[PDB]
Amino acid sequence: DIVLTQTASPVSAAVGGTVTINCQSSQSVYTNNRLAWYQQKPGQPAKEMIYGASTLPSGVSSRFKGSGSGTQFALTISDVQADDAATYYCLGTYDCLSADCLAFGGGTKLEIKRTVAAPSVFIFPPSDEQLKSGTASVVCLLNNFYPREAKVQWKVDNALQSGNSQESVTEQDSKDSTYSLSSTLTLSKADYEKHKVYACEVTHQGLSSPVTKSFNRGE
Amino acid sequence: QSVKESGGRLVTPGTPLTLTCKVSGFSLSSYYMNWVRQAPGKGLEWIGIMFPNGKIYYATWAKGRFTISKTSTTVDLKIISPTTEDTATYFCTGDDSGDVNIWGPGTLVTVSSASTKGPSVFPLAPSSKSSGGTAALGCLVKDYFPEPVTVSWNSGALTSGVHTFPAVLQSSGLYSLSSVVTVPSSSLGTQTYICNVNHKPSNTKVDKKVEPKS
């Protein structure tokens, strides 16, 4: 039942800027100084950024500063770079004879702010390969946009589709700080063959009017 | 200096399973070893620890549900009675109390009563509705289980422009994901594009060629 409460995510900064992430422990850590900070880029494992409240390991930039004691700690990242995009966890040590030896904080995501970029949009019809099995997947792709907020509207023969798509977004790109998204509408081969106009319509801050990409089935 | 987890597989609720972690470049009696897991999309949770002594301590929530043990060359984590709340990536770490802190790449444990299913791979063909020297193409890997699926392009020679999206859980209870790449338009006839899909939990491994359209 030890809980560490971090700053709410996200936490944002532009390249060159400065961020603080706070950790509050529900009871004092071992010798009021045993609190570490870990960096996790998505899909990777975590990296030790700071240990012993303020000790900076080798090969971790001095742009990372730990501070605090007792039940209150903070990691501060200065001169933020685009590859700092990750999620940061605190880890508290306690007395193994009276509580859990270790405990993790909820985590705080760092998002790198950059200029607003409108997506490049593409649409893909189903392959004949897939049709020959009873289902039809229409896919549209939004490429390299900032910020992540984007809405995709699916329209067949101009009727707004609801409930039959799913979407995925990449993680923020560690060089260009942008995002990418793919939407998949799935129909039965019957339904796909019944209609003609397939359209994906995108709405994003970086565009004043929505943009529409469409194909006509069998052209 | 190095650690690696293995053992993570699909497994029916209740049947036990042991993950193992094989050290490289140090001695078990010399580091602190911990197991840590991360359910998909959620955060790191700490399971338990083995001191250089040999003393072993568990998180309170973990007491009774896991066994941590060692065997000369490796550190082990047994999940005694897996529920679906136990599916996650499991991580092995090594710590010398000072400047070295070491993490394995992680191993995926899936608890369900579902069956392995290999994916089907379809092309997302470069079209006219897919710019100017900016042609988009890709692969759709659909209806597989469990995780994971890796995807590369031209056996690894194509790295730039590639976005492989996270998988989504469909209604059918099977995953589907796509991987796309942007490519010069002047390239579509000369150069050949092939996505290399590998779904090891079913020994599926298809390489699909993505050519344009008639």
Residue numbers in the entry:
A (entry chain A): 0 to 218
B (entry chain B): 1 to 130, 132 to 215
Sentences from the paper on this structure:
To identify endogenous N-terminally-ubiquitinated substrates, we discover four monoclonal antibodies that selectively recognize tryptic peptides with an N-terminal diglycine remnant, corresponding to sites of N-terminal ubiquitination. Importantly, these antibodies do not recognize isopeptide-linked diglycine (ubiquitin) modifications on lysine. We applied a rabbit immune phage strategy to discover four mAbs that selectively recognize peptides bearing an N-terminal diglycine-motif, but not the branched diglycine-remnant generated by trypsin digestion of ubiquitin conjugated lysines (K-ε-GG). Using a combination of biochemical and structural methods, we show that these mAbs predominately recognize the N-terminal diglycine with a relaxed selectivity for the third amino acid, enabling these mAbs to bind to a broad range of peptide sequences.
To gain insight into the exquisite selectivity for linear diglycine-containing peptides, we determined the x-ray crystal structure of the 1C7 Fab bound to a GGM peptide at 2.85 Å resolution. There are two Fab-GGM complexes in the asymmetric unit, with well-defined electron density for the GGM peptide that binds in a pocket at the interface of the heavy chain (HC) and light chain (LC) CDRs. The interaction of a GGM peptide and Fab has a buried surface area of 247.5 Å2 (Pymol). Close inspection of the Fab-peptide complex reveals a series of hydrogen bonds that facilitate recognition of the diglycine portion of the peptide. The sidechains of HC Asp95 and LC Glu46 make five hydrogen bonds with the backbone of the diglycine, including with the amino terminus and the two amides. The negative charge of the two carboxylates neutralizes the positive charge of the amino terminus, which is surrounded by the Fab residues and excluded from the solvent. Inspection of the Met-binding pocket reveals the structural basis for the degenerate amino-acid specificity at this position. The closest contact made with the methionine sidechain is a 3.1 Å hydrogen bond between the sulfur atom and HC Thr93. This analysis indicates a loosely packed pocket with both hydrophobic and hydrophilic character, which enables the recognition of a broad set of amino acids. Lack of recognition of Trp, Lys, Tyr, and Arg is readily explained by steric clashes with multiple sidechains that line this pocket.
